[PDB]
């Protein structure tokens, strides 16, 4: 502005937010995770079990056959192609997302790997080691190993390099953001999975009814090399009322808990003094030493490494080690399966002992009640798995299976003396089908609901679905609550109201998930900058060192953590270390934790420095920086590029995760909290907190909300449950989900005729593109009790406005049909069946079909009309209800239009699927006009249906002649406390009068008094009240009506799509009761609660009629000797017989439900004999 | 998608003022409120009709026609 070093204001933060969204976007986490996976993790996975060697020994049978061979198959680099599809005839061509969607093809690319096939041979002289030598046979080509689904708008997709004009040419919506997969033509999005972070020691308390008081557990996990998880638990046996409380640790493959002292001795620390040195680091913590006495007392008998090792070994469940391999087996267990996250190589027992001592020390602190049990809901201990890690582990499993199959083929060929064929040795279908199945279905194997069909009802719904997360719910905690650590990472208001409330979370606007990097460079840096190795750390001679942890691994200690942390922070700020790396310095606990693993949720914040020039702490970002940011923003529509990455590299913003948030102080705003330190009575009462140690500043508090919650105007003036309801409902409002709806073929689609952007808008919506694809309209709303037709959350709508086009929508419905070929004999064909050659053809009208069995677009269709005509052949010797003559040779399998739906056929396309069979897709348009049953809702949880529609002459009017487009009951305001609705109405009135967009961002300086002053400047009552007249008589209403524009949304629920009645209809084959489903003319359920209510009413006859006459009613014949209903009744001949009883004149008929008959027959099958008798045998 | 022909609330014809509104905004460098007042839209029901309209037909016209002639 004027000076390049002046402090910024609260308005300037939105420029930084805009730069952030320009660089990252809204599906940045999805795209980045998939890109990282495809770029690195594929090669990493293939570089684990690349080598498979099969050795054929000498097999000594004769002196002429003594050579031993060794065949080796190794995998090298991996190559990935562009998305391609192979047709049935074998022609392969590049595939685009539009064609994939239309043809139900999977958007995927092929994977190729270089394979080296070596063979060594050696002379196997008896009783000597072999010397394998290459036999000059080293073959080396690319082998197809399957197809990898490609996420849209990714580095491997065609649309990443496409411009706006290119997208328009390719029939793709520029506003589309990608982040999903196309499997079988259905868009699938991978919902992030929340799991507990590994390699972190967690101490928990156990309930009274148990022998364990405290347990310290670590789920040791290694991110690279084997992908298996091993859990280590240390339990403190005995309660506070016990005379001896010992500590025992559970090791894998041991079947029993071994004393910690014995484990230490097996690790090589025989002295009790050294064991206590490893556990307790203070010479005066006599309390902890006293609690440790029982452990050494228990482990007194063992006094040497060999005895401890054999003691551990004999407990293992191997039963192959007889008496001498026990020590080596225990050593191998303690080396490779004990704390694998530290290391798995020999010569690192000191680190294992120190880590075990650390775990025991934490457990003893918790037992002594110096620290509370670790919180399980802490978001810093949680990880979010995106599409990257999920596909990584799935590919790991599938590749292991593929390698196993390759080895099996090698063994089979070598043994059975067959020729080796690589095309059969490697089966690409393993990888291809595994990935396709895991993505098409939610079963993440060969967990549920990992993959869901992307919501395309509206743009905001799609964004929320792409930024949704899930948490799988034996656990002892309350994950459904909104934890404090969730601040700024997940939306506090957007969550389902059903059974998933609190388990399904939505990321905040500025939240991101780290992709992870290599920790080895950081380890080397720490080692070279004075991190003393843990192999020579003596606590007694340095009781001031800070323990350095990297990814949960205690790597060493440092003497000057202040300087170490200063250097590390400077490097991270200037960009030498990846910003996603988290660094926390627990000063009180003397710990320095560095986290590099992927899955950590973080968000950016401004950096606060002393800046002694002004004498007080201030933000590093200045008005010159903001000016350059805005210049770069507006030059696109040429100064040097200045982006969010430029800010990050200049160290003006910093990524912070939940764990690092534990050790920082954040100033809410720079307006008043940063400056060292009458008031308007209307402004909010804000607490300064008078703190002069701020280290960071929020970009803007309004960024804590999610995508759905960023549309609410003035959400801070609303009750939180109303905000949650609005977040849920805004995903069911009609809008314009995409601009290419005229070329997309979706099952169902809704498009508003005349979308309008809200008069009262929020600054966040600018980055959600709500002004480009709005879902709703600005209706003139009056809050009044006019006729009593808007009571109980109902509404009155203007029939004139409906006629002029208020809340009118287009409805597109798609039908798909295929020509199935059943074997070489049977095949179906699209045809226009005739009454003389087709059997069982529907009663509808076939006049609209053409010679190809399809209706041309633009033709009108109504209920029962056939839109796709198809026929299939039938086998002879099958007569149904007669009517089957030699003329009939085909049967109808046509697809009829829905009974209650009608419209005009819009677009019909014919193509071929992956198998080459002809299939067609037909789309039908319809117009939905508001009715007396349709549902509409505002942006404040106020939802209701149209009670009745009034014309303009009947609606109330003001002196200006303006009539309301919608009337809502005043009684909805007080109880729900949705003051945001009223404030939005007033702001919208002012905005419409002045020609501006209302600023309804949550936390700003806008006040009702200011809005009222602005409104009064326009010649209207300051509070929005207007004098109205009764439409029927024209007399002034005694009370004045709150009148103004308000943004209303049309929801997906329409009465015409729910109304259904049945007098009689089809019955299910099994129970012979009314079928389920309103689409099939099904009935309603008269459940147990209805039965109980009728019993209370005493309407026995009505209950019987409901259960018998309105449902299954069956007459059966029962024998008087046996109650069994096994009486053969020739009703035509008037004969009855119960074979087995040898009677024919002792038969009775009873009326019972077919369900009852089925139950009795099932019991008879299960060997139970329910005998029905028509006379009593015992007195009351 | 395209400018409504009539105002929903009162029925005033507003579909013949979209081009004039855009021209006033662009060439005359006039504010939205001033342009709306100059166009003869006095009631805020029509003011919102023209102020909050989103022109999606322009985006729809960017796609190549499905059928030629």
């Amino acid at each position: 502005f004027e000076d390049e070093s002046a402090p910024i204001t609260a308005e300037d933060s939105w420029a930084v937010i805009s730069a952030f969204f320009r660089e990252k976007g809204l599906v940045s986490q999805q795209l980045d995770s998939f890109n990282q996976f495809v770029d690195y993790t594929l090669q990493d996975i293939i570089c684990e079990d690349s080598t498979l060697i099969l050795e054929q020994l000498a097999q000594h049978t004769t002196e002429s056959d003594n050579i031993s061979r060794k065949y080796e198959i190794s995998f090298g680099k991996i190559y990935v192609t562009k998305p391609m599809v192979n047709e049935s005839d074998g022609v392969t061509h590049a595939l685009y997302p539009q064609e994939a969607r239309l043809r139900n093809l999977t958007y995927s690319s092929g994977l190729f790997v270089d394979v080296k096939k070596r063979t060594y041979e050696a002379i196997d002289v008896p009783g000597r080691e072999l010397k394998y030598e290459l036999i000059a046979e080293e073959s080396e080509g690319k082998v197809f190993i399957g197809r990898l689904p490609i996420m849209l708008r990714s580095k491997n997709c065609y649309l990443s390099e496409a411009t706006e004009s290119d997208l328009y040419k390719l029939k793709e919506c520029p506003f589309d953001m990608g982040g999903y997969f196309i499997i079988n033509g259905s868009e699938k999005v991978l919902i992030a999975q929340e799991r507990s972070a590994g390699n972190i020691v967690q101490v928990f308390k156990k309930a009274a009814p148990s022998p364990i008081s405290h347990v310290a557990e670590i789920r040791s996990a290694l991110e690279k090399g084997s992908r298996f998880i091993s859990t280590l638990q240390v339990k403190l046996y005995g309660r506070e009322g016990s005379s001896a409380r010992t500590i025992k640790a559970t090791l894998p493959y041991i079947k029993q808990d071994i004393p910690i002292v014995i484990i230490f001795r097996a690790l090589g620390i025989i002295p009790d003094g050294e064991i206590l040195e490893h556990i307790c680091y203070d010479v005066n913590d006599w309390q902890m030493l006293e609690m440790l006495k029982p452990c050494v007392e228990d482990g007194f008998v063992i006094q040497d490494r060999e005895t401890a090792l054999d003691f551990i070994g004999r407990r293992g469940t191997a039963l192959g080690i007889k008496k001498e391999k026990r020590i080596q087996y225990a050593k191998d267990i303690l080396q490779k399966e004990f704390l694998p996250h530290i290391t798995q190589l020999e010569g690192f027992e000191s680190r294992k002992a120190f880590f075990l001592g650390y775990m025991i020390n934490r457990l003893l602190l918790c037992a002594l009640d110096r620290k509370d049990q670790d919180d399980r809901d802490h978001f810093g201990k949680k990880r979010l798995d995106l599409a990257g890690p999920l596909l990584a582990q799935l590919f790991k499993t599938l590749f292991k299976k593929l390698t196993k199959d390759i080895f099996r083929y090698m063994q089979r060929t070598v043994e059975e003396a067959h020729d080796f064929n690589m095309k059969l040795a490697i089966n690409a279908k393993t990888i291809t089908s595994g990935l396709k199945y895991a993505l098409a279905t939610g079963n993440w194997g060969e967990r549920a609901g990992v993959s869901q069909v992307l919501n395309r009802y509206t743009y905001s719904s799609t964004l929320s679905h792409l930024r949704r997360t899930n948490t799988p719910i034996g656990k002892l905690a309350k994950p459904r609550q909104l934890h404090n650590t969730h601040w700024g990472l997940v939306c506090p208001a957007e969550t389902p109201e059903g059974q998933a409330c609190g388990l399904v979370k939505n990321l905040s606007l500025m939240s991101c998930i780290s992709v992870g990097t290599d920790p080895m460079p950081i380890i080397t840096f720490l080692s070279e900058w004075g991190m003393e190795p843990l192999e020579d750390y003596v606590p007694h001679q340095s009781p001031d060192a800070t323990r350095v942890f990297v990814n949960g691994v205690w790597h060493g200690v440092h003497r000057n953590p202040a300087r170490l942390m200063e250097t590390l922070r400077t490097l991270r700020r200037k960009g030498d270390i990846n910003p996603e790396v988290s660094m926390i310095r627990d000063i009180r606990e003397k710990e320095l934790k560095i986290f590099t693993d992927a899955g950590r949720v973080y968000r950016p914040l401004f950096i606060v420095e002393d800046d002694e020039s002004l004498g007080h702490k201030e933000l590093k970002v200045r008005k010159g920086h903001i000016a350059k940011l805005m210049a770069t923003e507006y030059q696109d529509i040429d100064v040097e590029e200045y982006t969010w990455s430029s800010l990050l590299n200049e160290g003006l913003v910093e990524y912070i995760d939940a764990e690092e948030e534990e050790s920082i102080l954040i100033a809410m705003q720079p307006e008043d909290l940063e400056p060292a330190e009458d008031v308007d009575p209307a402004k909010r009462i804000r607490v300064s907190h008078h703190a002069t140690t701020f280290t960071h500043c929020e970009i803007h508090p309004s960024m804590i909300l999610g995508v759905a919650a960023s549309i609410i105007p003035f959400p801070d003036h609303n009750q939180s449950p109303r905000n949650t309801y609005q977040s849920a409902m805004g995903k069911q409002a009609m809008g314009v989900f995409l601009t290419n709806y005229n070329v997309r073929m979706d099952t169902m689609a809704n498009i508003l005729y005349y979308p309008q952007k809200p008069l009262g808008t929020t600054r966040a919506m600018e980055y959600l593109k709500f002004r480009e694809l709005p879902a709703g309209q600005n209706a003139i709303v009056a809050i009044a009790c006019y006729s009593g037709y808007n009571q109980e959350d109902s509404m009155i709508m203007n029939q004139s406005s409906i006629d002029r086009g208020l809340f009118r929508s287009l409805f597109f419905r798609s039908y798909m049909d295929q020509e199935k070929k059943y074997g070489m004999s049977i095949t179906e064909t699209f045809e226009k069946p005739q009454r003389t050659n087709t059997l069982r053809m529907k009663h509808g009208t076939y006049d609209k079909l053409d010679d190809d069995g399809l209706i041309a677009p633009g033709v009108r269709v109504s209920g029962e009309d056939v839109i796709i005509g198809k026929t299939t052949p039938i086998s002879p010797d099958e007569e149904e209800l007669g009517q089957r003559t030699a003329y009939h040779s085909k049967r109808d399998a046509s697809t009829p239009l829905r009974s209650t739906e009608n419209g005009i056929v819009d677009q019909v396309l014919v193509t071929t699927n992956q198998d080459g069979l002809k299939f067609v897709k037909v789309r039908v348009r319809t117009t939905k006009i508001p009715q007396i049953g349709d549902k509409f809702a505002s942006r404040h949880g106020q939802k209701g249906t149209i009670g009745i529609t009034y014309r303009r002459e009947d609606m109330p009017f003001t002196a200006e002649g303006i009539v309301p487009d919608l009337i809502i009951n005043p009684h909805a305001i007080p109880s729900r406390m949705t003051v945001a609705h009223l404030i939005e109405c007033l702001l919208s009135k002012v905005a419409a009068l002045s020609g501006n967009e209302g600023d309804a961002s949550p936390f700003t300086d806008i006040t009702v008094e200011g809005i009222s002053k602005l409104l009064r400047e326009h010649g209207y009552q300051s509070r929005g009240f207007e004098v109205m007249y009764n439409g029927h008589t024209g007399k002034k209403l005694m009370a004045q009506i709150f009148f103004g524009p308000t943004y209303y949304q049309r929801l997906r629920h329409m009465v015409d799509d729910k109304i259904h009645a049945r007098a009689r209809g089809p019955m299910q084959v099994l129970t012979r009761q009314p079928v389920e489903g309103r689409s099939r003319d099904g009935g309603l359920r008269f459940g147990e609660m209805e039965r109980d209510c009728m019993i209370a009413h005493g309407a026995a006859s009505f209950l019987k009629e409901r259960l018998m006459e309105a449902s299954d009613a069956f007459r059966v014949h029962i024998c008087g000797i046996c109650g069994l209903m096994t009486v053969i009744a020739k009703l035509n001949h008037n004969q009855f017989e119960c074979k087995g009883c040898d009677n024919k004149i002792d038969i009775y008929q009873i009326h019972i439900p077919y369900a009852a008959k089925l139950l009795f027959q099932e019991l008879m099958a299960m060997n139970i004999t329910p005998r029905l008798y028509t006379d009593r045998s015992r007195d009351f | 998608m395209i400018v409504p022909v009539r105002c929903f609330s009162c029925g005033k014809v507003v579909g013949d003022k979209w081009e004039s509104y855009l021209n006033l905004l662009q060439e005359d460098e006039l504010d939205e409120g001033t342009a709306l007042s100059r166009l003869g839209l006095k009631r805020y029901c029509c003011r919102r009709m023209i102020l909050t309209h989103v022109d999606l037909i322009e985006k729809f016209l960017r796609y190549n026609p499905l059928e030629k002639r």
């Binding site: 507006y634 967009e997 300086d1005 | -």
Partner: peptide
């Protein structure tokens, strides 16, 4: 005591002219 309007149509013009 504040401006409850989002000035974006001509704020870009103001900034560009200032440059």
């Amino acid at each position: 005591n504040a401006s409850p309007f989002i000035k974006r149509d001509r704020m870009r013009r103001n900034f560009l002219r200032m440059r």
